[model samples]
Structures are given as C-alpha cells and as structure tokens.
Target chain A: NRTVVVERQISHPPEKLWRALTQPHLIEEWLMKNDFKPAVGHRFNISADWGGVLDCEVLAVEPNKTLSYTWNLAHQDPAFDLRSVVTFTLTPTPTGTHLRMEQSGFRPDQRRAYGGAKMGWPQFFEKLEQLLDRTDL
Target chain B: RTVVVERQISHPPEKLWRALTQPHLIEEWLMKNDFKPAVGHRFNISADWGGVLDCEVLAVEPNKTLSYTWNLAHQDPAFDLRSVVTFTLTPTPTGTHLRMEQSGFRPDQRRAYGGAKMGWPQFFEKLEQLLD
Candidate 1:
C-alpha cells in the first residue's frame, strides 16, 4: 500500500483560498486559461490527452474552510476507471490559509494517474499562490 | 487610440509565422493554446493575453503575414473591443524581424493601452528565450 500526500500553505484566508480552488473562474485564473463553466451536470473538454474529466459535485462545502468532492478520471479505461476522493482542508494561520489536499485510491497499474496527480497539484497550487500575490489576497 | 509593439525574433520569418499560426508550434512558445486557421475558431490564452481571444482568419499570406482580431468579451461588461493584431515577418541577414501591431482602442480603455505597452516587450523576450 503506497500513499502520497501534498500540502501547501497559502497566504490567504481559508475562505478565499477555498473559493480559488472551488470556483471555475478562480480555478481557471490559477490553473489553466480555458472556459470552465461548471454547473450541476456540466463537463468540459481538455485539449491534452492527459486532460480528462474535471467534473465534480459539491459533496460538502463549508465556505472558506473545507470542500470535498469526487474527482473523476474520464480518460481511463473501464478496467482502470479511477475515481478518487479529493478534500481541501483550509486552516487559518498568521499569514493566511494552510491548504492540505488529500487524494487517495491509487491502483498499482495506473502509474500515469498517480504520477500526474502528484505533479499536477503543485503547479495548480503555485498558480494559486501567484493569484494571491497578484490580487493581494 | 492604439499602440504598436514591434519585435525581431531570432528564428526566420517563416518559422516565426508558423509558430504563430500552427497550433502545436504556438503551444511551444506562447501559452499552450490550440488555433485553427478558420473563420470562426475560438480559443483561450494565458500569460499576458489570458482570456478568450476570439480568432477570425482575416488574411494568411503564407509565411509572410497573418492577421486576426483579438477580442475579450468574457471579462465582464462584455467589451466588443475589436482590435487588429497583425504580425508582419521580414527576413533579415541575422534573423526575422517580427513586427506586431495591435490597433483599435478608445480613450477610456487607457489601461489596455498601458498594458500593451509593457506587455509586448516581456512577451517578445519570452518568445526569444523560448526560441533559444
């Protein structure tokens, strides 16, 4: 059993950082510059082959504090159809928010899935930091 | 009120034009974007031009020039700011002298004017670095 954990301390309030992670526009602001209009049953296409289902349902939202959802991978085959739980736990610190993301459920054969999940979050987090710096958040 | 920002890239004029027009090549230098040389192809861009840059294939003179209207209506208030962003490629002994001119601006949109002033230089610098 192999598990990976990634954490970032953002210089923003828990709520502010939470919105940046959850809202589509704010998400695009830091992640990718694409039209991300997510409604109850909306799906967007990614150009890259690695681009897969980025759809999510709001399972639990504690505005600025916590947001949990089901992360779906649409590109994977039926045998490797991967679905994982993603949780954003925001803690208020002296500077801003301490964001901790936990993504579990890794299959041994799905190396690309695990590797991408590990590398991709940091880039998104880096963009989030840039947004905070630019917006003075 | 529009300002033109010109730059000379190291690559040949043909290469620079290809980099601008071709989707995969454009992704290498500019933001990772997909462009189609058609009449109504909509695309998005990050970096300085981070928004929906509605692309309309105005003219393609093959390896020499390419022109399109850069529009950003999605950024609230729905601005129909239609500006012609032209790339004129001139071959020099050293390399291609890429001249980028973006016209069509109004007096009230002074911030856009100022942004283009500083933004193009940085963009050209990045383009040069990417070419290297």
Candidate 2:
C-alpha cells in the first residue's frame, strides 16, 4: 500500500483546530465547502469525491487532540477505488497546534487516486489557514 | 440589476453542461447549493449577484440551455431587483462556447449592475478552475 502524508502547523490552539476539523460548519469552510450535515449513517456527495460516497462516521474522537476516520472513495469511474484511513493528530505547542494528517491504504495501481489527492490536500489546507485567519480562532 | 459573462472552455459542451447543472459538481467551484434542473426547483445564493438571489429553474435541456429567474430581496434598504439569467452552450471546434446573458436592471441600480460587470472576470477565473 502506498501512503500519503500531509501536515500543516496552524497558529490556533489544538482545541480550536480540532473543532474546525470535526465540526460540520467549520469543516464546510475549509475541508468540503458543502453543507456538511454529518450524522451516523448519513451519506452525502462531495464534489471532490467525484461522484462517490463521502461517508463520515465518528470513529474515534479525543477532545482537543485526535480524530480518526475511514475516508472511503467509491467513485463512478471504475478506475478509482480509494478507501483509506485518515488520522488527524494535534499537539499543542508554544506557538499553536501542530496538525498532522496521515492517509494510508492506497492500492499500488491507484495512480488517479494518488494524483487527485496530491493536488487536493494543499488547497484544502490553504483554505483551513484562511478560515483560521478569518475567524481568529 | 444583472451582470453577464461569457467564455469558451476546453471541455466538451456536455461536460461543461454537467459542471453547471449537476449538484455535486456545481458545489466544487460555484455556490454550494443543492441544484435540481427542473421547473420550480429553488436555490439560494448567499453572496454577490443581488446579495441573495433566490433562483427557480425555468427550463433545462441537457447540454444546450438553462434558464432561471433571479429574485433579489431588499435586506439592506436598497431597491429590490429581479431578473433572468440564461446560460446557453454551443459546440465549437475547440470545445464549448458559453454565452451568459442576464437581463432586468433598474436605472437606480446601475451602480450595483456595474459592480457585477467588473466581478465577472474574477468569477470566470474561478469558473475556469471548475471546467478544468
């Protein structure tokens, strides 16, 4: 399995960054930009998913620290089948929160998945930074 | 007041049509709203283009034309404006040529209308990303 890791250091506290990453309204600002109504067993379509199921369930949540979930991509294009585990680890620092994301479980042949994500994460992270700057959180 | 912008995208007309009409795809680059391409389908826009343009799909013919009514509310003590914005797609040798025309402007709202004329260039840049 090929793994992709993306990390960003946010100037906000761990708790603030944690809320932005997990809460539906906050996530909508940076992560997905769609109205995120996340409830258990709720299935929604994200534009980034490319006509796939962007299913989210609260797998494990540690307040002000860590969030883990299964990021599944079952796109209509048969060439792409990407199901991975995403873990957001936040550590409080003197400056702010050290945010790290590790995504794994990519098949060796899934070049489209890898390439799409490589281009996507940077934009999402940049938006996250903008959200923080706008909200002062 | 309404502003119109036109452009030619490298994608086929069909793909461009889908990008504009499909709910999942429209959310990527345009306003994030649940879009349904049918008569009486309602949509809300929170940003510019009359602050909050309440839209109802008037007509939808795949890969060809989309027409809608744009209703603006008076939330800030300004004149309320209502108009029609139509998106017409034509096939070209290069790809799809898009013609957008928005009509219905009151003379008192000319300043706002002019602002939209200038804003389309930026919005089209974002639309390029959507087409890409």
Candidate 3:
C-alpha cells in the first residue's frame, strides 16, 4: 500500500493545533464543512467543494498528539472505492509544533488518487497555516 | 408543495433497479444509504450537508415500483420535513420510463420545495451516467 505524507513545522502549540483539527467551526475554516467530534467511532461527513461528500469515522484520538480516521468514498465500481486512513501526528517543538499528515491505504492501481492526494494535502495545509495565524484558538 | 421528475432512460428496468436498490450504485448517484429492498426496513440516507434523512421502505416491487418515507427532523422545528418518495418504472421498447415523486411538502416550505425541484433532475442525470 502507498501513502501520501506531508510534514510541516508550524509556530503554534499543539493545543491550538488540536483545537483547530477537532472543533467543527475551526475545521470549516481550513477543511470542509463537517460535523466532526473528537470521539472514536463518531461518524461524520465532510462536504467537498466540487459537489461531492466524504464519509468518515473517527478511529483514533489522542488530545494534542495523535488523531486518525477512516476516510471513505463509495462509487459504483467497488474496486474504485477509496477506503483509506488519515492520520495526523503532532509533536511539540521548542519553537512551535511538528505536524505530520499521512493518508495511507492507497492500492497500486490508484495512481490518479495518489496524485490527487499529493497535491491536495499541501494546499490544505497552506490554508491551515493561514487559519492558525489569524484564528483565536 | 411537491417535486416530480420523470426521465426516459435507455436502460431496462432490471438494470435501473439495480442502480436504485444497490448501496454502492445509489451512493454514486443519490446519497449514501444502508438500503435494503424489503418492505418495512428502516434506513438512513446521508447527504453532503451532513444531514441524515430517516427513511423506511413502504412498498417494493422488483423492477417496477419502490416507495419510502423520506423524513428529516431538524433541530429547528420549522425546518422539519416529512414526505414520501415513490419511484415507478414502466417498460418501453427503447428502455424504461421512470417517474419519481416526492410528496407531502407543506405549503410554507417553498425553499425545500424549490431545492427538491432542482435536486432530483441532477440526481437522475448521475443515475443515468452510472447506468451507462
């Protein structure tokens, strides 16, 4: 299985980053509109900009340190279904925080999806950094 | 107030029925659902907006008809909607003639009525693409 991973160093505490990741209102600022709660097994939907929606469920959560979820999108052809996991790891640095985002479970056949993930996460993190700078966590 | 959409699809009833009743195909066109074709089975239809509509199958006739209650109760009572959606498929020489009706909108629900009026046709287009 292949994965798309992006790492960034943000000048914000893990506490502030965790709030933005878990809180619904803060999430909408950087990600899609969602009803996400920070509890394991909670199901949520994130509305996409292009008239699509992603079905997700929380699989793991550890305040200010680790978070993971099942990110799935169904299609007519089950073989093309995107059944993946997104994990976010946060490590507190003396200067700020170290953030690692990994979207794993890509099959060898998912070349288009791999390309999408490579481009998409970096763009999202850019917005996330902008949000962190302006928002009051 | 209600919404109705009809389309003449160049596919047979059995094929269309599979798209309508199967979970994966329905997700491609309509919304995510844990739908079973048997009457009396309750299901939830989830949308992009994070809303889940409570539904129960009212009637089912393979490749010909399916009816279900489509009800959504928002936190705000004014936004609550209770309705029924029915699909009828008639065989044609070319393919199948399908009609969809979502009834039971209140007179005051102009917004919901308008939204549905615009939503179903686009949904049908996606359904046709899935069938193709």
Candidate 4:
C-alpha cells in the first residue's frame, strides 16, 4: 500500500472549500502552484521550492466533490519513474465538509518518500483549513 | 492512497532480501510468505493463526527493492487493502538500511469511493453553487 490517506472535517461548506482547491492562488496557499485546470484531458505541472516539478494530468474532475490526477515524476529519471495518483474527495456534513486526500502507488523501497509524503500531507491539510478561515476565498 | 513503517536494521541487504523471498524462511515467519521476484506472479502468506493474505509481485530489483500487492485473500472487492507493499534495501556502512513499507493500507472503496454513493455529488453541487 503506497497510498497516504488523511481526512479532516472543516467548518466550511464544500462550495467554499472547492474554491480553495481549484483556484491557483488558493492552491498555492495550500498545495503547490502551476498551470492546473479543472478540466479533463488537461496537462499540468506543479512546481515546488525544491526545484522539482510533479508532472500531472487531469484524469478526472467533478468540480469540488472529486478530483483525481496522474501525479508522476517519470520524465525526470527512469529509475525515479513513479506513476501515482492523488485524489481529493469532498463530503458535506452537518458540521461542514469532510475532505479526504489519498496519494497512492508508493513502493516500500522509497523509505523517505513514504515518510515524507505521509508526514507532509497533514501540513497541507492544515494550511488548507487555515486558508478556509482566511477571508480570501 | 499512503506511506510506511520502516527501520534500519543491523543486517546486510543481501541477507535481508533472501530472508524475505526464500519461501522456507518466509514460511518460518509471517505466519508464512514467499515472492516469485517478478511482476504479476501472485504469492500467498498465511498466518499461523488462520489469516491468509494474497499478493501480486509488481516490481523487483534483487537486493535493492521488491514490491507487491498485499491484501486479505478474501474475495470481497470492497474490503481488500488493494495496496502494494514495496521493500527497498539500501547499503549503509554499518550494515544495510532495510525499509519495509506497507503503503495504501487498504484499497477497498467500491461502496463509497469519493463519497459518490454517500452524497458527494450533492455536496459538490452546493459548493459549486456558492462559487458559481
């Protein structure tokens, strides 16, 4: 199981939360930044401060409810060729919304990778919640 | 989608790799296990206490790495972990850095993947309404 799954319940509606996820600026506040579009068949790249880019493609999009993409690093190095999937599932609750993120396709040989990814996602989710509290979106 | 539970062991990479793949040794542990060291070859491990897990070898690289799908042998699609377990061994001066990773704990999501059957569309609808 190379997937890292995390769930958080927020006090905002899915509509508001979707904005944070889909908007490029809002995404930078949480995830990474690049030419990402919520459209099928679109290719994108998410660049981080580490100077490495996570090449991606819109595999499926349903506005805020579900967004799954091909998260790959194959082009950089054949040995480092990792084809993975990242999916965001949004659910409305009486409290607000439940956002779950799962990044799958990790191999055990990638020790630090698995640890970093699992440890890293919580921060992004925390940032997302913080942004949700922010009046920007 | 997942990460891992790993540790650096005071052992050599080759030794560790053998201990994992050699069936007799695997049967000596786990309850019992062995891998064919290639992609698509299915393997089985049964615990002494009556737990059986099924696996499909996905990738292999001698002492460097070994990965496969690990999950319950049950026929139910909605309860399988549907996860791949990869073992990567790195050589350190002391011994070998043994990384045993079980990512994607479970992959069964047919019943409620992405809140589809549980109301994601409606929630998404509400959110889009606010944004729209």
Candidate 5:
C-alpha cells in the first residue's frame, strides 16, 4: 500500500556505489547538498538551492552492504511535512553490485509527491552512472 | 516510514475535493470526519469500532491538493503515529488521477506519536535557524 523502491544492476562495485551514495561530495552531485556522514547517530540536512531542507539522520550503517537513515520534515502543517526513512542496500554480484533503494510513507492522496519522489532515483542513478564512467572509482 | 496510495477515478478534481473536505461525504468512505478545508483547522476522525484519530489541517490548495496531520491518541495502541496525509489531484483525459501520501511513521514505523526517538529531523531545525 505504501512504498517506492528502485533497484539497479550496476556495473560498478559495491564499494564505489557505497561511496557515491554515502560520501557527501558524491551525494550532493546526485541528491541534495548537505553535510552527510555514514556514521549511525549522525544528523544531517540536504538543502536545495530553492531553500528547502530535508533533515536526515543515520539509522544504520554496514559498509559496502547496507545503509539506512531518516528522511523527515517537521513543520506545523502535516501536509507538507515529510517524515520518512531511506534505505540503500548493496549485494555483491559477479558483474558488480545489486543495489536496492527503498523509501516508504505515502498515502493515496499524495500522487504528486510520489511521482516526484519516485522520479528522483532514475535521475540520480543516471548521474551515478556518469560518475562511475568518469573512472573516479 | 509512510504509506502512499494512488487511484484514477472517473471524476473531476472539484467533485473529489468535496468528498475529501466535506465532513459528511468523508464518512461515506473513510470515517466520521470532523473536517474543514481551511489551514490550521483542527478535526477528529471516529470509526464504527470506536477508533479515534486526531488531525489538523496543514495545507489547502483548492482542487489540486490537501494535507493534514493524522495523529493517534485513542483506541488500540500498537501502532501510534503522528503522520501527515496529503491528497493530490491531477487532471487526465478520462478523469482525475488522485494520489494520497502519508508521512510520520517509520521507515518501518521509525518514530512518531509515542514511538521511539521522539525528535524532529535536522531539516526543520535548519529552517528554524535560517528563520531566526
């Protein structure tokens, strides 16, 4: 009833994807610009140039395997406010890595936001592929 | 964590917005709704089984969107959440496509409404800092 998942078979190794997904410099290239760390219990924020900030917290971290964090918005108005979780999992593959990312918490009335949020992965993954192609490792 | 659901209904957004905002029509499909389409409006939702949900309006964008807070303060206590529910309507050739999204639970019920880690995320704090 609620969940948006994006899975990709990446030619890049688990370590590389983990860096792109975890490291702040690489993350800002795909997602938002913020102070992001892969350490559990660390708090961070991803801010858009348009002045929207997505507050997040690291919930779990297992290097080269899995990472989970909080994606929350706290406003008095619950409608625009977003409080959710984001998880990225990586599995070893002969080709490279099997990456699965999931974010849940949408109601029937949020199609617009869902569409917008669901579209984000493809756009980011595209950038990741480009980043991977650059031989940055 | 949150729930997102969507449907394509063969009706205009204006008609759907009424059922979503008007108290009487809301009960037909959902619950006994005490609602208003105004921002900052407080309301309650009651069910036949005596479940009670506390809510407050957060945004009202006419036929296009509506958002509110859905909080649990009564009845069963297993999965209490302070959630934000938003409804979005889009015009289509055949009808209107409706999407509903609810936030404020866990990635797996992470935290909200008597749940663990009773804290707001840093994004809001950053906003507050900038505002201040």
Candidate 6:
C-alpha cells in the first residue's frame, strides 16, 4: 500500500487554519466546491468542474487540532475506485501552525500522478496557504 | 489529459466520414446522436446507459476534419467534465488514416480520464465492424 503525506508550516494560527480546512466556502477557494460540515460521520461531496465527484464522509473532527475524512473516488475504471482516508493534523508553533496531511489507500500498482490524492494534495495545500493569506476568515 | 486513437482503416475518407456524420450510422458505432456535419450546430449524444452529452459542432471540413464539444454534467462533480472530440481523416493510397482525439480533462478527473483511454478503442472496434 502507498500513502501520500504532505506537511507544511503556515504563518497563521490553528484556529484560522481550521476554518479554512472545514468551512465549505473556504474549502472551495483551495479545493473543490463541497458541502462540508464539521460533524462526525456527516456525509458530503466535493464536486469537480465536469462530472468528477468525490464521495466523502467525516470521520473525525477536533476543532483546531485534527480532522479526518473518507476521500472515496469511484469510477468506471475499477483501478480508479480508490477507497482512501484523508487526515489533517495541526500543531501550534512559535511562529504559527504546522499542518500535516496524510492520505492512505493506494495499491502498489496504482499510479501516483492522478490529481485526487497524491499530486492534488500538495497543490491544494499551496492554494490553501494563499487563501489563508488572502482573507481573515 | 487527452486521449488519442489513431488507425489506418481500409476504407475511403468519404465512407468513413459518412459513418461519422450520419446520425443512424453513428448510432451503430458511437452513440445515438443528432449530429450534423455543420459548424456551430448543437446536438445531443445519448448512450445506452441513459447518459447524455451536450455537444456543439466547432469545426467541419467535408470528409477531412470534424470537431465538436463533448460536455457532460453529472450530479457528482468529479465525473462532470467538458471536453472536445475531434476526428481527422486523411486519404491514403490504400484507404484512409483516422485520428480521433478527445481532450480537456482536469487533473481531478483521473478516473474518467483513464476510463476514456480504454473506451475509445472499443468504440473504434465497433466502427470497424460497421465499415466491414
């Protein structure tokens, strides 16, 4: 099994960073448009521009410390039906906060170039940092 | 990501173009569509599984090149994508060279992108059956 891990240090506190991670409006700025709510087991979807949709469900939510969800990607191509989990951890730092994300569920044979999990998270994190700097919320 | 399928078919360009443009012939190979070989014409392509693609002809060159937009909106945003399908026919000594390209896939649509890689070849096989 393969897991994609991305870690970053942001110049913002965990409280503000938490909102960007959980709030739908904030998420859309960096990720796809979603109907996310900060509740355990709550089901939601992050829609893509065309027909791609991510089926997700909240697994764990800890206000400013941790958050986790199921990032299920299903497709006609069975190889792409990846059942994965995405978890985010935030730790307070002297300057601001340290953000770490992990997505686990890939088989050894699966290509890592697909945008949803491996390559997508790093890019999304980059966008999230820009969004954190753009707005107060 | 873009999917490209090229083949050297043992048929004339005009005959292959007819199979591509005529609605009834297209239904035998691709999908049930109201496609016309005129630029800017709008059409709908419905699959056997109740899926539909909203399309608009973009370029038309008699028996030479044809291009159109292939858009499908799904309730699941991940599967929703807008793309363009272009078919180029080149006359060869023996028959015709066919090149079909479907482009405009986002990175997030990896599943659909890969699925298309496998899908087009199968459709072309059906086209061979029709041509025969």
Number of the top TM-score candidate: 6
After superposition on all C-alphas, the RMSD of every candidate to the true structure, in Å, is 9.3, 12.3, 10.3, 17.9, 14.7, 13.5
Kindly provide the TM-score obtained by chain B of candidate 5 when compared with the true chain B.
0.75
lDDT of candidate 1 over B1-132, digit per residue (tens): 666777766777766766788877676655545577664555544221112244566777777878777654422222335577787888888898888888876666554566667667776777777667
Compose the digit string of candidate 6's lDDT tens values, residues B1-132: 898999999999999999999999998988667898888998877532123467899999999999999876555555677899999999999999999999999898776687678778888999989999
Across residues A42-72, which tens digit of lDDT does each residue of candidate 5 receive? 9987654322345689999999999998876
Query: In candidate 6, which residue ranges exceed 4 Å CA deviation?
Result: A113-116, B1-132
Q: Judged by TM-score relative to the true structure, which candidate is superior, 2 or 3? A: 3
Against the true structure, what is model 2's DockQ?
Answer: 0.04
Looking at model 3 chain B, report the run of 10 residues with the lowest lDDT sum: B72-81
> Tens-digit lDDT track for model 2 on B1-132?
456788988889888888888876765666545568897797754321012345789889899999987655442222355778789999999998888777776777654466457555665677778777
Clashing pairs in 2: none
Model 4: CAPRI class? incorrect
Q: Top model by DockQ, which number?
A: 6
Q: Write the per-residue lDDT of candidate 4 for residues B8-120, one digit (tens) a residue.
A: 55667777777667777554433245567777897665332112356788888998989987654223344334556677789988666755555553345432232222232
Local lDDT at A137 for model 2: 31
**Docking quality category of candidate 2 according to DockQ thresholds:** incorrect
Q: What is the DockQ of each candidate?
A: 0.04, 0.04, 0.04, 0.02, 0.02, 0.07
Backbone clashes, candidate 1: 1
Interface RMSD in Å per candidate, to 1 decimal? 12.1, 14.9, 9.0, 17.5, 14.9, 11.9
* Candidate 1 TM-score restricted to chain A: 0.76
Per-candidate total of colliding backbone pairs:
1, 0, 0, 15, 30, 13
Query: Can you tell me the CAPRI class of model 5?
Result: incorrect
Candidate with the greatest lDDT versus the true structure: 3
Judged by DockQ cut-offs, the docking class of candidate 6 is incorrect
Clashing pairs in 3: none
**Fnat of every candidate, listed in order:** 0.00, 0.00, 0.00, 0.00, 0.00, 0.08
- Estimate the TM-score of every prediction: 0.54, 0.52, 0.53, 0.49, 0.50, 0.55
